[PDB]
Design a protein around this motif. Structure first.
Motif, PDB file in Angstrom:
ATOM      1  N   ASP A   1       0.804  -1.210   0.000  1.00 49.75           N
ATOM      2  CA  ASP A   1       0.000   0.000   0.000  1.00 49.75           C
ATOM      3  C   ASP A   1       0.842   1.268   0.000  1.00 49.75           C
ATOM      4  OD1 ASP A   1      -2.378  -1.454  -0.027  1.00 49.75           O
ATOM      5  OD2 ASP A   1      -2.452  -1.581   2.162  1.00 49.75           O
TER       6      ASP A   1
ATOM      7  N   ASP B   1       3.792  16.541  -0.939  1.00 50.30           N
ATOM      8  CA  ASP B   1       4.262  17.892  -0.653  1.00 50.30           C
ATOM      9  C   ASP B   1       3.109  18.848  -0.362  1.00 50.30           C
ATOM     10  N   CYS B   2       2.007  18.736  -1.104  1.00 49.64           N
ATOM     11  CA  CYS B   2       0.872  19.636  -0.940  1.00 49.64           C
ATOM     12  C   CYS B   2      -0.011  19.282   0.247  1.00 49.64           C
ATOM     13  CB  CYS B   2       0.021  19.654  -2.213  1.00 49.64           C
ATOM     14  SG  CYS B   2       0.814  20.419  -3.646  1.00 49.64           S
ATOM     15  N   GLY B   3       0.215  18.142   0.890  1.00 49.56           N
ATOM     16  CA  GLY B   3      -0.537  17.773   2.066  1.00 49.56           C
ATOM     17  C   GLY B   3      -1.734  16.883   1.819  1.00 49.56           C
ATOM     18  N   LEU B   4      -2.089  16.624   0.562  1.00 46.53           N
ATOM     19  CA  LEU B   4      -3.197  15.716   0.292  1.00 46.53           C
ATOM     20  C   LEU B   4      -2.779  14.271   0.533  1.00 46.53           C
ATOM     21  CD1 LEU B   4      -4.671  17.362  -2.928  1.00 46.53           C
ATOM     22  CD2 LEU B   4      -5.546  17.479  -0.607  1.00 46.53           C
TER      23      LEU B   4
ATOM     24  N   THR C   1       4.127  25.043   0.040  1.00 48.87           N
ATOM     25  CA  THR C   1       2.754  24.944   0.527  1.00 48.87           C
ATOM     26  C   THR C   1       2.553  25.745   1.810  1.00 48.87           C
ATOM     27  OG1 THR C   1       2.608  22.753  -0.477  1.00 48.87           O
ATOM     28  CG2 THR C   1       0.932  23.317   1.135  1.00 48.87           C
TER      29      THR C   1
ATOM     30  N   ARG D   1      -2.294  23.368  -6.565  1.00 43.19           N
ATOM     31  CA  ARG D   1      -2.577  21.937  -6.477  1.00 43.19           C
ATOM     32  C   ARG D   1      -2.955  21.346  -7.829  1.00 43.19           C
ATOM     33  NH1 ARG D   1      -5.988  21.375  -0.779  1.00 43.19           N
ATOM     34  NH2 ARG D   1      -4.260  21.976   0.601  1.00 43.19           N
TER      35      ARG D   1
ATOM     36  N   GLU E   1      -6.987  -0.030   0.540  1.00 40.11           N
ATOM     37  CA  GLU E   1      -6.453   0.995   1.437  1.00 40.11           C
ATOM     38  C   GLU E   1      -6.060   2.255   0.667  1.00 40.11           C
ATOM     39  OE1 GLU E   1      -3.150   2.295   2.179  1.00 40.11           O
ATOM     40  OE2 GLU E   1      -3.959   3.403   3.887  1.00 40.11           O
ATOM     41  N   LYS E   2      -5.398   2.099  -0.477  1.00 35.25           N
ATOM     42  CA  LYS E   2      -5.125   3.271  -1.299  1.00 35.25           C
ATOM     43  C   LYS E   2      -6.386   3.798  -1.970  1.00 35.25           C
ATOM     44  CE  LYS E   2      -1.564   1.185  -3.284  1.00 35.25           C
ATOM     45  NZ  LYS E   2      -0.416   0.966  -4.200  1.00 35.25           N
TER      46      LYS E   2
ATOM     47  N   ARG F   1     -10.313   9.710   0.742  1.00 35.67           N
ATOM     48  CA  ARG F   1      -9.981  10.761   1.701  1.00 35.67           C
ATOM     49  C   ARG F   1      -9.624  12.066   1.003  1.00 35.67           C
ATOM     50  NH1 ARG F   1      -5.348  12.701   3.845  1.00 35.67           N
ATOM     51  NH2 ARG F   1      -4.113  11.151   2.692  1.00 35.67           N
ATOM     52  N   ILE F   2      -8.869  11.980  -0.096  1.00 28.88           N
ATOM     53  CA  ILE F   2      -8.532  13.176  -0.872  1.00 28.88           C
ATOM     54  C   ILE F   2      -9.789  13.812  -1.459  1.00 28.88           C
ATOM     55  CG2 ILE F   2      -7.252  14.020  -2.875  1.00 28.88           C
ATOM     56  CD1 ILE F   2      -5.197  11.816  -2.316  1.00 28.88           C
TER      57      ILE F   2
ATOM     58  N   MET G   1     -11.786  15.555   1.282  1.00 28.88           N
ATOM     59  CA  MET G   1     -11.205  16.842   1.667  1.00 28.88           C
ATOM     60  C   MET G   1     -11.479  17.921   0.622  1.00 28.88           C
ATOM     61  SD  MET G   1      -7.266  17.720   2.687  1.00 28.88           S
ATOM     62  CE  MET G   1      -6.746  19.409   2.962  1.00 28.88           C
ATOM     63  N   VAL G   2     -11.416  17.560  -0.663  1.00 27.22           N
ATOM     64  CA  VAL G   2     -11.678  18.537  -1.719  1.00 27.22           C
ATOM     65  C   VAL G   2     -13.155  18.936  -1.742  1.00 27.22           C
ATOM     66  CG1 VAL G   2     -11.604  18.890  -4.195  1.00 27.22           C
ATOM     67  CG2 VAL G   2      -9.691  17.851  -3.062  1.00 27.22           C
TER      68      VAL G   2
ATOM     69  N   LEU H   1      -6.223  19.217   8.878  1.00 22.88           N
ATOM     70  CA  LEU H   1      -6.515  18.079   8.007  1.00 22.88           C
ATOM     71  C   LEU H   1      -5.426  17.899   6.949  1.00 22.88           C
ATOM     72  CD1 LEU H   1     -10.373  18.523   7.668  1.00 22.88           C
ATOM     73  CD2 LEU H   1      -9.099  16.932   9.129  1.00 22.88           C
ATOM     74  N   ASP H   2      -4.190  17.768   7.424  1.00 25.03           N
ATOM     75  CA  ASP H   2      -3.041  17.413   6.596  1.00 25.03           C
ATOM     76  C   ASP H   2      -2.188  16.418   7.374  1.00 25.03           C
ATOM     77  OD1 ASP H   2      -3.509  18.819   4.198  1.00 25.03           O
ATOM     78  OD2 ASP H   2      -2.692  20.672   5.039  1.00 25.03           O
ATOM     79  N   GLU H   3      -0.997  16.137   6.849  1.00 25.68           N
ATOM     80  CA  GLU H   3       0.000  15.354   7.565  1.00 25.68           C
ATOM     81  C   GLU H   3       1.139  16.205   8.105  1.00 25.68           C
ATOM     82  OE1 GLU H   3      -1.092  14.473   4.530  1.00 25.68           O
ATOM     83  OE2 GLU H   3      -2.166  12.587   4.855  1.00 25.68           O
ATOM     84  N   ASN H   4       1.162  17.501   7.788  1.00 30.06           N
ATOM     85  CA  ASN H   4       2.214  18.374   8.292  1.00 30.06           C
ATOM     86  C   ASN H   4       2.014  18.736   9.757  1.00 30.06           C
ATOM     87  OD1 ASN H   4       1.885  19.598   5.087  1.00 30.06           O
ATOM     88  ND2 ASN H   4       3.873  18.839   5.801  1.00 30.06           N
TER      89      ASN H   4
END
Lengths: 217, 53, 281, 336, 5
Positions: free
Chosen positions: A178, A213-216, C39, C101, C206-207, C213-214, C217-218, C275-278
């Motif tokens: 995955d 990079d963009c966070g998505l 970003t 984006r 899972e992907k 999920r993407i 969010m959009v 709502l990101d991973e940063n």
């Protein structure tokens, strides 16, 4: 304070600007590691393209400058220099089908592919594999089929699915499915569109890199 | 045995080195760095009068 | 009756929550990311442009209970200028992030050339300047004309008297709600239609839910944009055609209309930096 | 096969001598000397000029200029007092593993993954930096480069050997063939007569540039060793390895003198250095940080956590004013 | 927006 040193800060700003534009020049390029087996045929998949430990191959395809590294002419311990290659975009992994049944080299190509796919530095990097020598594999199975050097095989003793079995048996070696995607092409002595496949897979990795990079992601 | 006899000659050259037992050759490592505690700017932090940082 | 002092708490709760969220976002950007990538420049832009307009919110609150603009002329021009400036900046930062984006996904080859952290700051300075180039014709006519008894805060026009200000509402509508919705629904829909044809996100359950999920969010950012800035533009258009009968149930809903006009500014912290991973690093 | 029996007899002699004429007991020679408290050190300066993971650190005798290369092929000569830069040398062998800086300050060295120890000229007329010689002759990869003088150079190259050249000829004037695995680190003495090299054999051998034949040999690790540094007395050296063990070998006693390992560490070592007195040892771990051991009490005396990624090289000055921890997060610090 | 006017 800072009477004569301002000339040195001017120098240290100008060459820092040169470092910044050189890093931006090296960022819009894209590097690909290129492993392979001994006497596999990875020199053909730097001959299909336009084009000492590492020897570069800096070529281009639609404003996307590829840098191949056919490293395998370096005989040393792979563990203590492979950490230089994290952050590489794709990893071409050439596997022969002309060294298909010589001392059975395909199993040691599986050992090397498992050692590079489950390597802790490459847990995210996609690994393209070019199964070379299709044009000799398709007539080295019609005479001496694949049930010799494969115990758990039966059925298609032609080229037709017996190469799809080798593709599935390579693609069933990632413990982490995955995260990384394993691509597969069948190269040839003609139909020079392998760099289109490299461009497609590297584009499919630049999508995932820009989503990270963009966070998505 | 072109490399094994090199190993024999290497360990035969290395066998006759005069040892000294470590009460006499690690207490000198303490007596050295006991007489260089003044010239060490990471043992006791030196103030900014002599620090160029 | 007793709604005029109770509406202020629920109308400045937007100020409190949005100011806390935007200060949290600009603090975590300035203290944990160091503006190194492209970003976080846009995220800090949207956080600052939302924070200043969110801190502006109590100044509109006194214009219901007090009746006046009890700040004198020494704040009316300034507050109108930064309101109509940070509104267009919070719009154009979302537009530029959407174009960023879209370039990063749909055109992956050219995205290596464009969205360097130097060009992101350059287009950031460009849209701040382009927001100033339409916020200053708001600013130079942001007069103060007294009522029966009050001090007020409003915009009279040049010659001609009643039409050259009537251009401004239509211009903010067609240049601040029609163009950003029309750019960030197509500029994201072609991104979704591209990501559905990506081998990294197509199969592999899972992907597949990562692709889900993407898309969630959009749809959340586009739907909260439309849901926040639908009424404050629809009402300001309808207030120009018909003179609304002064029903006492209107104006509580009109300060609520301003409140959900600024709910986008309030929730962009919850929309992006949470709502990101940063945020996890 | 009896020659292998004689080799095993000599190895079981050199182990039996230090098992029969050595009484190490350094846990008894640390009941008098008192520890150094806690060493509070903070990053005075953060040198921010690279865009890749760096792999090198070495300072000159002036303790003002350092030099460091990274993956982008830009080894830049920093300045430690004013945070600035003085040179940003372009190069071709972009996969640089190490650098050096000559004691005169006139030359830097490069060296990477393509058998080339590029040594550069700096104080040259009528322009900027310039490649002086293109040193080749190995088979594997350069791993550590050090200068003896401005004429001579010893290295540590991944084809199992070490070398000593002349710059003015480029020829390997002395080879060092004593390993069975790849060498990884290299370090020098105050008199630059005898150096030490640490390899994948879990053995750090002492070579000398007088003859070319090693005088001692130091086994004891379980895995590859990745950092060597001489003690400033020139009579001890610390080896850091992937065994989470920066053990301190002796030379006059000639065995493992004392071993450094904390309980919660499984990670490896990429760099080891001492102070200019040597009471404290600057171990650089793979726990995305680096620590400071007390090099005569086997106890930890500081933790220099200031990075986000693993350190690679760690240089300490000649006057002892600073350390220089260079991580893969492109931000090489200068603690004090 | 909305407020002032």
């Amino acid at each position: 304070l800072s009477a004569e040193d301002k000339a040195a800060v001017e120098r240290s700003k100008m060459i820092d600007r040169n470092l910044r534009e050189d890093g931006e020049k090296a960022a819009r390029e894209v590097k690909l590691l290129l492993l392979g087996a001994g006497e596999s045929g990875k020199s053909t998949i730097v001959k299909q393209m336009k084009i000492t430990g590492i020897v570069e191959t800096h070529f281009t395809f639609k404003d996307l400058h590829f840098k191949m590294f056919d490293v395998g002419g370096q005989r040393s311990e792979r563990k203590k220099w492979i950490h230089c290659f994290e952050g590489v975009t794709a990893i071409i992994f050439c596997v022969a089908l002309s060294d298909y049944d010589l001392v059975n080299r395909m199993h040691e190509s599986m050992k090397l592919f498992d050692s590079i796919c489950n390597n802790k530095w490459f847990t995210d990097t996609s690994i393209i594999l070019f199964l070379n020598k299709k044009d000799l594999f398709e007539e080295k199975i019609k005479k001496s089929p694949l049930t010799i050097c494969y115990p758990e095989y039966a059925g298609s003793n032609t080229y037709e699915e017996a190469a799809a079995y080798i593709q599935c048996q390579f693609e069933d070696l990632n413990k982490r499915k995955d995260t990384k995607e394993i691509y597969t092409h069948f190269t040839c002595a003609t139909d020079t569109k392998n760099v289109q496949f490299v461009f497609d897979a590297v584009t499919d990795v630049i999508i995932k890199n820009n989503l990270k990079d963009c966070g998505l992601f | 045995i072109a490399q094994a006899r090199k190993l024999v000659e290497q360990l035969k050259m290395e066998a006759n080195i005069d040892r000294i037992k470590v009460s006499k050759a690690a207490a000198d490592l303490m007596a050295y760095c006991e007489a260089h505690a003044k010239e060490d700017p990471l043992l006791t932090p030196v103030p900014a009068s002599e620090n160029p940082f | 009756m007793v709604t005029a002092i109770t509406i202020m708490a629920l109308y400045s709760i937007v100020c409190v929550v949005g100011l806390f969220g935007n200060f949290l976002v600009m603090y975590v950007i300035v203290r944990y990311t160091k503006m190194k990538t492209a970003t976080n420049i846009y995220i800090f832009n949207l956080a600052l442009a939302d924070a200043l307009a969110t801190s502006t919110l109590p100044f509109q609150s006194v214009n219901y209970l007090m009746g006046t603009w009890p700040f004198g002329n020494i704040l009316c021009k300034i507050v109108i200028s930064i309101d109509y400036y940070n509104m267009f900046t919070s719009i154009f930062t979302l537009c530029t992030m959407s174009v960023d984006r879209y370039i990063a996904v749909c055109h992956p080859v050219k995205a290596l050339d464009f969205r360097t952290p130097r060009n992101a700051k350059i287009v950031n300075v460009c849209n701040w300047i382009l927001s100033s180039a339409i916020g200053l014709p708001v600013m130079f006519m942001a007069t103060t004309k007294y009522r029966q008894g009050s001090i007020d805060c409003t915009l009279t026009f040049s010659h001609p008297t009643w039409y050259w200000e009537n251009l401004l509402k239509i211009c903010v509508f067609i240049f601040a709600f029609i163009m950003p919705v029309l750019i960030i629904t197509v500029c994201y829909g072609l991104m979704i239609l591209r990501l559905k044809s990506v081998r990294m996100l197509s199969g592999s359950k899972e992907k597949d839910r990562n692709l889900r999920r993407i898309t969630r969010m959009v749809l959340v950012v586009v739907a909260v944009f439309i849901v926040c800035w639908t009424p404050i533009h629809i009402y300001v258009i309808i207030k120009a055609l018909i003179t609304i009968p002064e029903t006492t149930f209107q104006t509580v809903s009109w300060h609520f209309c301003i409140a959900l006009g600024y709910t986008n500014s309030c929730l962009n912290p919850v929309l992006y930096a949470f709502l990101d991973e940063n945020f996890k690093r | 096969d009896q020659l292998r029996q004689e080799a095993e007899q000599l190895k079981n002699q050199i182990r039996d001598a230090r098992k029969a004429c050595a009484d190490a007991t350094l846990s008894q020679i640390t009941n008098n000397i008192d520890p150094v408290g806690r060493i509070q050190m903070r990053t005075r300066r953060t040198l921010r000029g690279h865009l890749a993971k760096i792999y090198a650190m070495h300072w000159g005798t002036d303790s003002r200029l350092l030099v460091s290369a990274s993956q982008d092929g830009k080894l830049i000569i920093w300045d430690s007092y004013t945070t600035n830069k003085v040179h940003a040398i372009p190069l071709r062998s972009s996969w640089v593993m190490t650098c050096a800086y000559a004691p005169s300050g006139n030359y830097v060295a490069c060296g990477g993954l393509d058998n080339i120890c590029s040594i550069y000229n700096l104080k040259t007329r009528e322009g900027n930096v310039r490649v002086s010689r293109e040193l080749a002759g190995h088979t594997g990869y350069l791993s550590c480069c050090r200068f003896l003088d401005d004429n001579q150079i010893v290295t540590s190259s991944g084809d199992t050997t070490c070398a000593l050249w002349d710059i003015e000829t480029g020829q390997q004037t002395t080879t060092f063939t004593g390993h069975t695995g790849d060498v990884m680190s290299l370090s020098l003495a105050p008199d630059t007569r005898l150096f030490v090299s640490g390899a994948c054999d879990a053995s750090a051998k002492l070579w000398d540039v007088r003859e070319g034949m090693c005088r001692q040999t130091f086994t004891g690790h379980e895995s590859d060793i990745n950092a060597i540094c001489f003690f400033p007395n020139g009579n001890a050296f610390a080896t850091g390895s992937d065994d989470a063990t920066c053990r301190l070998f002796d030379l006059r006693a000639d065995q493992e003198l004392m071993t450094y390992s904390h309980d919660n560490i499984i990670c490896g070592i990429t760099s080891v250095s001492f102070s200019k007195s040597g009471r404290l040892l600057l171990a650089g771990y793979d726990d995305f940080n680096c620590n400071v051991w007390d090099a005569l009490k086997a106890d930890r005396a500081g933790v220099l956590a200031g990075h986000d990624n693993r350190v690679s090289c760690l240089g300490v000055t000649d006057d002892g004013m600073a350390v220089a921890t260079g991580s893969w997060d492109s931000f090489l610090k200068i603690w004090n | 927006y909305x407020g002032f006017x």
